[PDB]
Amino acid sequence: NLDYRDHEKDQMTCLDTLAAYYVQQARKEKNKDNKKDLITQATLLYTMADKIIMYDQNHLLGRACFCLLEGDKMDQADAQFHFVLNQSPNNIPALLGKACISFNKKDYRGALAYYKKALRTNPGCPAEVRLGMGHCFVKLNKLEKARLAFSRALELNSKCVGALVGLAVLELNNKEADSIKNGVQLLSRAYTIDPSNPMVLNHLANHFFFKKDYSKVQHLALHAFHNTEVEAMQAESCYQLARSFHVQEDYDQAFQYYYQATQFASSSFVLPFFGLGQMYIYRGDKENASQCFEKVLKAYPNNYETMKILGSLYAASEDQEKRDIAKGHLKKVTEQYPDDVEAWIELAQILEQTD
Amino acid sequence: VDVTRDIVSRERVWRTRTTILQSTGKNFSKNIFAILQSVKARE
């Protein structure tokens, strides 16, 4: 306000952009700046924005979104997002903030009811607000709903890869049917339009792994690893590298990748625990392969995991801590017939002390 | 010679002397030392 005759309102509207686009730009960081470099500028000017007008339609958005960037205080962010309904909720993303916090607490029922209001009004957003709804239609067995969400997102704008790689992930389960669409239309198209994505790089790597082309899996998994920040993608990017190294009789480099796959993200999937189980067999340190294979049964048993601890069975005699698991594993290979050849040997190798 | 470690490393001894002493079942001494101690107090 130099000579504008009481124009403080537009000044606060100006500083609101400097208190919201900083948090919006902190997520898509480049290679010369860090996260705190855009967080510290988002924390200073927000206090100066609240000197004129406090607690407005967007000022609570900053207090709520400050917690998503550090990964803590979820109840604080949900209680700050609810206030925009009680002050003046004149937009849809004024309410969409609660569903992202409901998603972080593993609440898809509370998130799906909030993502419905995003399509009725359908306000303006280049990010295809229908994409987060198609992302929650992934769970609770709504495959008829998530494709119908990704198709509209692909018809409004094909620039978005977030509506295309989902259909690739919706189609990765069919390995005998629809392979060309899954390696070309869902993997070669998402790659040429956006090569800096570690998801499509991981999926092109795991697709090339079955075709016995290991020259590109290790090349793409290095680029699928350095640009990601959250622990969900990096454990899998290290897991592809250690899987490509195990089949080459290269367990030295693959052991550290198998350790990083479990040290980064342990409750993600059963694959890193099984990889460390088959890896600890090396160098005669098969003691820890049992500890790492114990967590494989905790999710679900497998006909392939039963022979792992049976082969690496340290039970010898008068040792019921370890023979019960070999017996219970052998009871799994006894019914099924996956070309059993040595399965009956390990059966009788325990029953010599017993009947 | 190596014929010793060639055989003592692959064979299996399921039964030996001390095996013979314990029952194959589960007969602890809670039901044994009880009467064993009751006999000493009456004397």
The DSSP result for B1-43, as a single string, is -HHHHTTTTT------HHHHHS-SS---STTTHHHHHHHHHH-
Q: How far apart are CA A307 and CA A26, in angstroms?
A: 48
For chain A, the residues before each gap (C–N > 2.5 Å) are none
Question: In this structure, what are the phi and psi dihedrals at residue A96, rounded to the nearest 5 degrees?
Answer: -65, -15
Q: How far apart are CA A310 and CA A329, in angstroms?
A: 7
Name the minimum distance, in Å, from the CA of A345 to any CA of chain B: 14
Report the residue of B10, B12, B24 to disrupt the A interface, i.e. the one with the largest count of A CBs within 10 Å. Answer: B12
Is A141 in a helix, a strand, or coil? coil
CB A331 within 8 A of CB A347: no
Q: Solving technique for this entry? A: cryo-EM
Within an 8 Å CB–CB cutoff, is residue A354 touching chain B?
no
- Spell out which residues of chain A touch residue B12, defining contact as CB-CB under 8 Å: 317, 352
Distances (CA, A) of A273 to A35, A288, A299: 31, 11, 11
- Spell out which residues of chain A touch residue B14, defining contact as CB-CB under 8 Å: 317, 352-353
Name the minimum distance, in Å, from the CA of A349 to any CA of chain B: 10
Q: How far apart are CA A44 and CA A22, in angstroms?
A: 11
Nearest 10 degrees: CA dihedral of A350, A355, B6, B8?
A: 100
Q: How far apart are CA A199 and CA A149, in angstroms?
A: 20
Q: How far apart are CA A92 and CA A123, in angstroms?
A: 7
Q: How far apart are CA A234 and CA A228, in angstroms?
A: 7
- In 3D space, the residue among A143, A76, A142 whose CA is nearest the CA of residue A105 turns out to be A76
CA angle A61, A123, A79 (to 5 degrees): 25
- Spell out which residues of chain B touch residue A317, defining contact as CB-CB under 8 Å: 12-14
Q: How far apart are CA A296 and CA A227, in angstroms?
A: 30
Q: Is A73 exposed, middle or buried (0-12, 13-18, 19+ CB in 10 A)?
A: middle
Query: A284: which DSSP letter?
Result: G
CB A139 within 8 A of CB A108: yes
Q: How far apart are CA A301 and CA A351, in angstroms?
A: 23
Is A224 in a helix, a strand, or coil? coil
Residue with tokens 């190596």: B2
Query: Residues, chain A, total?
Result: 355
Closest CA in chain A for residue B14: A353
CB A77 within 8 A of CB A67: yes
Q: Where are the alpha helices (DSSP H) in A157-300?
A: 165-171, 180, 188-193, 198-210, 214-223, 231-246, 251-264, 271-280, 287-299
Within an 8 Å CB–CB cutoff, is residue A141 touching chain B?
no
CB A15 within 8 A of CB A49: yes
Residue with tokens 């625990």: A273
Residues 6+ apart with CB under 8 A from A244: A205, A209, A214, A217, A218, A221
Closest CA in chain B for residue A319: B14
Helix (H) or strand (E) holding A14: helix A8-26
Q: How far apart are CA A298 and CA A197, in angstroms?
A: 32
Closest CA in chain A for residue B13: A317
CB A204 within 8 A of CB A223: no
- In 3D space, the residue among A296, A263, A260 whose CA is nearest the CA of residue A277 turns out to be A296
Question: In this structure, what are the phi and psi dihedrals at residue A119, rounded to the nearest 5 degrees?
Answer: -100, -20
Q: How far apart are CA A276 and CA A254, in angstroms?
A: 9
Nearest 10 degrees: CA dihedral of B7, B9, B11, B13?
A: 120
Nearest 10 degrees: CA dihedral of A337, A342, A347, A351?
A: 160
Q: How far apart are CA A274 and CA A261, in angstroms?
A: 11
Task: Compute the count of residue pairs across chains A and B with CB atoms less than 8 Å apart.
Answer: 6
Read off the amino acid at residue A47.
T
